[PDB]
C-alpha cells in the first residue's frame, strides 16, 4: 500500500535530517561540537553559573522603584552577572576579559559559533561546549542563548571558578584536543557494516 501517510512531511524530513547527521562525514570544525562536557562537569558548571543569573525585568523594575520611592520622600558595589549575547561575548573574548565561556552545541545556523572554540583557544580564554542552547537561556532569562560567559565573580566564588576552569581544562580541553581535529560522522549501519567491514 502507501503507509507513508503515518508520518507527516515535517516529521519525515525532521528524522531524515537526523539520519543524515550521523551518516555524513562531517568536517572537523563542525565535528568538534559533538564533544561536550560530561554529566558531573556540566552539573557543577551550572551551579556556579546559576548564582550569577541576571535580574529579570520585574525584579529590576521593583529595585529601581524602591530607590525612586526613597528619593521622592527624602555608594554601591559593581554588580555581577553572566554575560551573554554573541557580539558582546565575542568582544569580551578578544579583549581577554572572559574567565569562562560556555558555547551551545545546537545553534541552527552552526556557522554562528564555529569560530568560537578557535577564537577562545587562540586568545587564551577557557571555553567549554555545553549541551543545550535552551539551558543557557534559563540562566539568562531568555528562551535560548547561543553563548554565556563569566567576566567578574564575587570574591566568595573566586576559588570555585578557578577550580571549575581547571576541571574543564583536564576533562574537556586536554582530553579531546587530539580527536577534535578529526573528521567525524563515519558511523556505519548494520546493513552496511555487515557487507563492508565483514567482506
Amino acid at each position: 500500500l502507501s503507509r507513508y501517510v503515518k508520518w507527516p512531511e515535517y516529521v519525515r524530513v525532521q528524522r531524515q535530517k537526523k539520519i543524515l547527521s550521523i551518516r555524513l562525514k562531517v568536517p572537523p570544525t563542525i565535528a568538534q561540537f559533538q564533544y561536550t562536557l560530561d554529566r558531573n562537569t556540566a552539573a557543577e558548571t551550572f551551579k556556579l553559573f546559576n548564582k550569577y543569573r541576571p535580574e529579570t525585568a520585574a525584579e529590576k523594575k521593583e529595585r529601581l522603584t524602591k530607590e525612586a520611592a526613597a528619593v521622592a520622600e527624602g555608594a554601591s558595589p559593581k554588580p555581577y552577572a553572566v554575560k551573554y549575547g554573541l557580539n558582546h561575548v565575542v568582544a569580551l573574548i578578544e579583549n581577554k576579559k572572559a574567565k569562562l565561556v560556555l558555547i551551545a552545541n545546537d545553534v541552527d545556523p552552526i556557522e554562528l559559533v564555529v569560530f568560537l572554540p578557535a577564537l577562545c583557544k587562540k586568545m587564551g580564554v577557557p571555553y567549554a561546549i555545553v549541551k543545550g542552547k535552551a539551558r543557557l537561556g534559563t540562566l539568562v532569562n531568555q528562551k535560548t542563548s547561543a553563548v554565556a560567559a563569566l567576566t567578574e565573580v564575587r570574591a566568595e566564588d573566586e576559588a570555585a571558578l578557578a577550580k571549575l576552569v581547571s576541571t574543564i581544562d583536564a576533562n574537556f580541553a586536554d582530553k579531546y584536543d587530539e580527536v577534535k581535529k578529526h573528521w567525524g560522522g563515519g558511523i556505519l549501519g548494520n546493513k552496511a557494516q555487515a557487507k563492508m567491514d565483514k567482506r
Binding site: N50, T56, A58, E59, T138, L139, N141
Partner: protein, 260 residues
Amino acid sequence: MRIKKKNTRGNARNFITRSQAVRKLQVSLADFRRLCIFKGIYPREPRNKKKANKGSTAPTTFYYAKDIQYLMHEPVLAKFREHKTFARKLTRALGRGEVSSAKRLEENRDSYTLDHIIKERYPSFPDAIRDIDDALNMLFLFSNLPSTNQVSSKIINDAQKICNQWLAYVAKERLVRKVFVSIKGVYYQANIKGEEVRWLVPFKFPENIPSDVDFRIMLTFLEFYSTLLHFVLYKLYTDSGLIYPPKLDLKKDKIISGLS
C-alpha cells in the same frame, strides 16, 4: 419540501448525548461534569429512546440540547480556560528555575465565582432554603473529616466554620423543632422561614476513608454548597438584625470550639 430525512428533527434535536455535548462544548469530560454539578444540569429520559438516539438501541445518556446551549454562554467556562493557561504558564515559570516570577504569577490570579449560578438556580430565598437540606448534609459530613492528600485542612476548616455559624444562628433563634438520634448520626429538623430543614450530623469519631470514593466530585459539590451557605447565612443573619460574619471568641474557642 423534497422528502425530509429521518432521525434528524423531533425528539432527536432536543436530546443530545454526552459525547456530542462534550465535543460541542470543546471541553474535557471532567470540566463538563463540574459545569453540570454547578449549574444543576441532569440527564433526561426521552419517551422514544430509539428515536433520540438515531435508530440505535445502544445505551447512552441524553441531555436536553437547550440546556447545553445555555451552558455554552456560561462565564465559568472562560475562567476554566484561563486557569488552564495560568497553570501552563506557572509550570513554565518553575521549570525555568525562576521562583520570583512564579510567586508573582500566583499573586496575579483570580478564580471564578458562583454568585450568578446560585442566583439563577434559586431565583428566590425559599428555593435556597429548599436545597439547604442537602447542602447542610454535605457540609456537616466534611466538617467531621480528617485532612488528607486530596482534601486539605483549610477546606475542612471552612466547612466547620460554616457549620458552627449555622448552628449558632439556629440556637440563637430557637428554631429546632424535631430531633432523632440514629445509628448513622443525629437528625435535626428546624423551621427556617416557614420551611422544614432536616440535616444529619455524624458522631464525632475518627473516620475510615475508603479509597473507593472519588473526592474529586465531592470537592466540587462542597465548593458549590459552601458559597450557597455563605449567601444564605448572610441573608439570615441580616434579616434578624445580627452582625455577620459573627465574631469568633478566641478565648472560648480554645476549650471546646463549638457553636458557643
